Structures are given as structure tokens and as C-alpha cells.
Enzyme design. Structure first.
Site, mmCIF file in Angstrom:
data_model
loop_
_atom_site.group_PDB
_atom_site.id
_atom_site.type_symbol
_atom_site.label_atom_id
_atom_site.label_comp_id
_atom_site.label_asym_id
_atom_site.label_seq_id
_atom_site.Cartn_x
_atom_site.Cartn_y
_atom_site.Cartn_z
ATOM 1 N N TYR A 134 0.890 -1.223 0.078
ATOM 2 C CA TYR A 134 -0.037 0.077 0.028
ATOM 3 C C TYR A 134 0.825 1.364 -0.179
ATOM 4 C CZ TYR A 134 1.249 0.964 4.971
ATOM 5 O OH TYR A 134 1.832 1.169 6.008
ATOM 6 N N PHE A 173 3.186 10.488 4.430
ATOM 7 C CA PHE A 173 3.168 9.655 3.333
ATOM 8 C C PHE A 173 3.892 8.324 3.703
ATOM 9 C CE2 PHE A 173 2.341 8.903 -1.288
ATOM 10 C CZ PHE A 173 3.190 7.616 -1.356
ATOM 11 N N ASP A 174 3.433 7.152 3.541
ATOM 12 C CA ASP A 174 3.678 5.772 4.176
ATOM 13 C C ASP A 174 3.678 4.919 3.001
ATOM 14 O OD1 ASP A 174 4.296 3.686 5.772
ATOM 15 O OD2 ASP A 174 2.127 3.598 6.550
ATOM 16 N N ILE A 183 -7.523 -0.219 10.937
ATOM 17 C CA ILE A 183 -8.651 0.738 10.913
ATOM 18 C C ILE A 183 -10.009 0.052 10.143
ATOM 19 C CG2 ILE A 183 -7.378 2.899 11.395
ATOM 20 C CD1 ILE A 183 -7.728 3.573 8.207
ATOM 21 N N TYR A 232 -8.942 7.134 12.434
ATOM 22 C CA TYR A 232 -8.519 7.310 13.617
ATOM 23 C C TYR A 232 -9.346 8.487 14.449
ATOM 24 C CZ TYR A 232 -4.054 5.172 12.454
ATOM 25 O OH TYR A 232 -3.231 4.423 11.739
ATOM 26 N N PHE A 288 -5.537 5.994 0.646
ATOM 27 C CA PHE A 288 -4.838 4.648 0.370
ATOM 28 C C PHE A 288 -5.008 4.228 -1.290
ATOM 29 C CE2 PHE A 288 -5.918 4.460 4.894
ATOM 30 C CZ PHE A 288 -4.492 4.169 5.375
#
Ligand SMILES: COc1ccc(CC[C@@H](OC(=O)[C@@H]2CCCCN2C(=O)[C@@H]2CCC(=O)[C@@H]3CCCC[C@H]32)c2cccc(OCCN3CCOCC3)c2)cc1OC
Length: 128
Positions: free
Chosen positions: A45, A55-56, A75, A101, A118
């Protein structure tokens, strides 16, 4: 931008129909099969705050993100959205804070009332 495109073309996949989780399919996966509650799921992802500089990406850490579907290990948007995916599918997901969250956020990293975006690729799933 990609978040605005999910807003416009994205299917509401929530039970309540509150647009809290919107989905567009960016690449069609295999067959008809979608994962079951408790399946061990493997994804890559890319995640970010919708209008925000965070950003991840699992691609970075050269390891698929693995979790147990429908068991609250992620989540809510992901328990909802990944259950709709086929193997090899890539989707875009826009997640209201209610399905992410919430009012609390998760500081210092995630702020209050954050809408998340995402890109999710479903690599594999297999029964636990
Ligand atoms: C029920 O509600 C919740 C359930 C779980 C969590 C923990 C957070 C969980 O991360 C997530 O849910 C989502 C989906 C999966 C990708 C990561 N993710 C995020 O929001 C990322 C976390 C890192 C980050 O800072 C990113 C910033 C850009 C937005 C996306 C953020 C996460 C993060 C890191 C690892 C995780 O692993 C799952 C662990 N499993 C399997 C292996 O053994 C232990 C259990 C899971 C919070 C919740 O809040 C409401």
C-alpha cells in the site's frame, strides 16, 4: 488529484451509506473470490493524509503488510475495503476519520479528524 477522483467516481462501500469509505478499482484482480473474515491478507500500500504532508509506503520497507481480516487489527476502512478486493486487485480508498483514527487522531503522527487516502494492492490471502 487522486483523492478528488475517489470523491467523484468512488463507490460507497459502507453499510450505512454515509460515504465514509469510498472505493475505485484501479486494476482488476483475478476470478471472483474475495477474502473471508480471519483470512491472513498480504498487501502493498501507499497511504497519506488526504490534504496533508504525511506519506507511508510498504514498498519502501520491501515487505508486504500482513494482517488478519475483519478482526480489528487495522482501521475500519481497511476491514471494510479489503474484504471487497480480489487477488491482484489494486484500489484507491478515501477514508473519513470515523473509519480511521477519529476525533482523537493518533498524535504526534496522525492529527485529529484526519481523512486518509490509500492505494492498496491485494497480493494474497489464505485461511488462518
Ligand atoms: C480498530 O482500529 C484500529 C486498529 C488498528 C490501528 C493501528 C494502526 C494500524 O494502521 C492502519 O490501520 C492503517 C492501515 C494499514 C496501513 C497502515 N495504516 C495507517 O493508518 C498508516 C500508519 C503509519 C502512518 O503513519 C501512516 C501515515 C499516512 C496515513 C496512513 C498511516 C497498524 C499500524 C501498524 C501495524 C499494524 O499491524 C497489524 C498488526 N497485526 C498483525 C501482526 O501481529 C499483530 C497484529 C496496524 C488503529 C486503529 O484505530 C482506530
Amino acid at each position: 488529484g487522486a483523492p478528488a477522483t475517489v470523491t467523484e467516481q468512488g463507490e460507497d462501500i459502507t453499510s450505512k451509506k454515509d460515504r465514509g469509505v469510498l472505493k475505485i478499482v484501479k486494476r482488476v484482480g483475478n476470478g471472483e473470490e474475495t477474502p473471508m473474515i480471519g483470512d491472513k491478507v498480504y498487501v502493498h500500500y501507499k497511504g497519506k493524509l488526504s490534504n496533508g504532508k504525511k506519506f507511508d509506503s510498504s514498498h519502501d520497507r520491501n515487505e508486504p503488510f500482513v494482517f488478519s481480516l475483519g478482526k480489528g487489527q487495522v482501521i475500519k476502512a481497511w476491514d471494510i475495503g479489503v474484504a471487497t478486493m480480489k487477488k491482484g486487485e489494486i484500489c484507491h480508498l478515501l477514508c473519513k476519520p470515523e473509519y480511521a483514527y477519529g476525533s482523537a487522531g493518533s498524535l504526534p503522527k496522525i492529527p485529529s479528524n484526519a481523512t486518509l487516502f490509500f492505494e492498496i494492492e491485494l497480493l494474497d490471502f489464505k485461511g488462518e
